[PDB]
Design a protein around this nucleic acid. Structure first.
Ligand code: MG
Ligand code: MG
Ligand code: MG
Ligand code: MG
Ligand code: MG
Ligand code: MG
Ligand code: MG
Ligand code: MG
Ligand code: MG
Ligand code: MG
Ligand code: MG
Ligand code: MG
Ligand code: MG
Ligand code: MG
Ligand code: MG
Ligand code: MG
Ligand code: MG
Lengths: 84, 122, 140, 37, 84
RNA sequence: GGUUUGGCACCUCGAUGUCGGCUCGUCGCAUCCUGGGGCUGAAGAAGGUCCCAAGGGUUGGGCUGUUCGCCCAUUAAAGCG
RNA sequence: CGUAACUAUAACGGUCCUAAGGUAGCGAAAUUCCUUGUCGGGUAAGUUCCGACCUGCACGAAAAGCGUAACGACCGGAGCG
RNA sequence: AAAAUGUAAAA
RNA sequence: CGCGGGGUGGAGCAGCCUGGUAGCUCGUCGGGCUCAUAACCCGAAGGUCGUCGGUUCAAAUCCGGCCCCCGCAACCA
């Protein structure tokens, strides 16, 4: 299962090695719970509407929430915070 | 009596030597162009370094014609060639000097710089 | 679109439309109906245009009853070809309508609306129309 | 809408004056002026 | 040019991130040195052949290395530790 | 509407010369200018859209047999049948 | 049909068929349909012309192939007078 | 008889 | 559009004429030979037969309607 990272969906985790790795812990933990549960369990993994049609958002804290998008074996990463 | 296809001797140092009358800029169907009328044109042969290169579409004022000009006072003036003086869109001479006499029709037509610059005016 | 899912034959003659109406001369379904004043072949797409037109108007509203069904194949020869060498290939389908046939019926919407919704549909149509209520339509 | 073959009423302040054999439609605002030509 | 890891890569990367930060930062450092302009850059680019062929290799700290693939946007990290 | 491509095969095969150009025009209006005017998301200058109105206008070249187009330099405009 | 560092392209490969699958050299040509191909050049402007490129509808070796000084009331493109 | 190539870090 | 030819495992081709299961080469897969990759050797799995309907007891096969591929023909004014 290959992992996807958009343009903006990269600099995030990347700047997390300069400002508290706390949030990093989530990324990683959330990632694995998605490799065997596309959108089940951790962070009450749910889908999305309009803008994010077909995007499932997993809870990191309450604010941030990395939205994945499994497909023919391939977990995608879009935004760990704000939006696109 | 200049008309499209006519060759004009350029009377100035804009670098050009001879231009071909592309069109006479008077009415919407002006037949000929004479002393004082503006014309569009093609540079047919110019000098090495020069403000103007051949193949350039320019604008100029007719200053000399082989067809005599009739004066309101019954006199006539005729030159040995058909010369013009390249000018820019504001109708100002693109050159810094002007060679050979020019017709005073040039003044009333409103081309002072050329007249002052002209070495003689008949 | 709207066309018979299957047919005994694929091409069928033209035949003339002679007055009367034979059927569907009375409402029987909704509260307001639209009837035909003059005969014609209504195209599978004049209908769908009227239908859509209706709902387009009263969105999320009542229920529309399409009382006619284009089951007759409309033939047409290839552009610029001479007469003969067979019958044209089928170009589409139509429904024979005669003066008196009720084409559409709406129900579950304010009169004022049904009047409009039906009125609009009459415009997407090749013949003159007249709207109706539900009075003496008691053959049932 | 100055001219057409379907002059109708638009706003509640639109009159259907009929002058010079033509069926005009004068209204408070110009954009509604008409004339059945 | 979106970033893409995979099985042996994310796991290869997590170990780096959770076993030594000297090479983690060195790794993503090149990833940014590539992500933009691939091939040419740091480490010591060099087209690979055979086992890898379509894969590229960026000299890292001698023994260690990183293999990837370039394709009109969308990079592809394949490996983090071990020679070739 | 009858300017296109066609359908039909009615006069014409004891012959109705069939593209383009040139010369000469004349007519239509569904108007390209110019003249009147209504709206405008019309401030003004400039435009847009529709209405009235041919009286008169409606350029010169490059390429191609071309009509047509495209291009050059103009123009109030370079109208369509 | 497939394949080389983005893309492209495919020296390479796979397979089917043939009697054998067009070599050199030429190539939008007295040949190129699409086509006024696309870049150059010449012109103010060039469906022609000249130089190039080759996805050659539909060149190609003695019904010769590609060239060639000289010659031509031959056909094309340009200038000057 | 015939049988090819070569995994990229020089202290 | 007018004729005629053809869409069958991933690729390229048989099988259809002679209706009663599918074949061939390459590839793919598992195992050896090797220091390793080829090549070489062993043994595998994989085909809705373009599609929607028909004839038959049974349709890749036979008849039909569309759908793309290929090839010919489009002449006289
Ligand atoms: Mg030059
Ligand atoms: Mg590639
Ligand atoms: Mg006719
Ligand atoms: Mg006859
Ligand atoms: Mg008859
Ligand atoms: Mg005859
Ligand atoms: Mg006779
Ligand atoms: Mg012709
Ligand atoms: Mg009029
Ligand atoms: Mg080959
Ligand atoms: Mg050519
Ligand atoms: Mg041609
Ligand atoms: Mg010439
Ligand atoms: Mg010529
Ligand atoms: Mg030759
Ligand atoms: Mg070595
Ligand atoms: Mg093996």
């Amino acid at each position: 299962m290959k992992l996807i990272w958009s343009e903006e969906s990269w600099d995030d985790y990347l700047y997390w090695q300069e400002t508290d790795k706390r949030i990093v812990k989530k990324i990683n933990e959330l990632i694995k719970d998605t490799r065997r549960t596309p959108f089940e369990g951790k962070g009450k993994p749910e889908p999305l509407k309009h803008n994010l049609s077909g995007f499932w958002s997993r809870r990191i804290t309450e604010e941030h929430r990395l939205v994945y998008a499994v497909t023919d074996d391939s977990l995608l990463i879009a935004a760990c915070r704000y939006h696109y | 009596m200049i008309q499209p296809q006519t060759y004009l001797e350029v009377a100035d140092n804009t670098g050009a030597r001879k231009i071909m009358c592309i069109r006479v800029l008077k009415g919407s169907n002006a037949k000929y162009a004479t002393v004082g009328d503006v014309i569009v044109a093609s540079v047919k042969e110019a000098i090495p370094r020069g403000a103007v290169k051949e193949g350039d579409v320019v604008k100029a004022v007719v200053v000399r014609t082989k067809k005599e000009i009739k004066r309101p006072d019954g006199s006539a003036i005729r030159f040995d060639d058909n010369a013009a003086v390249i000018i820019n869109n504001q109708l100002e001479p693109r050159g810094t000097r002007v060679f050979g006499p020019v017709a005073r029709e040039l003044r009333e037509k409103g081309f002072m710089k050329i007249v002052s610059l002209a070495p003689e005016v008949l | 679109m709207l066309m018979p899912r299957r047919m005994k034959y694929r091409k069928q003659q033209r035949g003339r439309l002679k007055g009367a109406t034979k059927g569907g001369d009375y409402v029987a379904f909704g509260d307001y109906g639209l009837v035909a004043l003059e005969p014609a072949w209504i195209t599978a797409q004049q209908i769908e245009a009227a239908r859509v037109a209706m709902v387009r108007h009263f969105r999320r509203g009542g229920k529309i009853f399409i009382r006619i069904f284009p089951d007759k194949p409309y033939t047409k020869k290839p552009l610029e070809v001479r007469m003969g060498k067979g019958k044209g290939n089928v170009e589409g389908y139509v429904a024979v309508v005669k003066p008196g046939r009720v084409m559409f019926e709406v129900a579950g919407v304010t009169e004022e609306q049904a009047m409009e919704a039906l009125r609009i549909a009459g415009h997407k149509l090749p013949i003159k129309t007249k709207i109706v209520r539900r009075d003496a339509y008691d053959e049932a | 809408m100055k001219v057409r073959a379907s002059v109708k009423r638009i706003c509640d302040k639109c009159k259907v004056i009929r002058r010079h054999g033509r069926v005009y439609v004068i209204c408070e605002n110009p954009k509604h002026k008409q004339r059945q030509g």
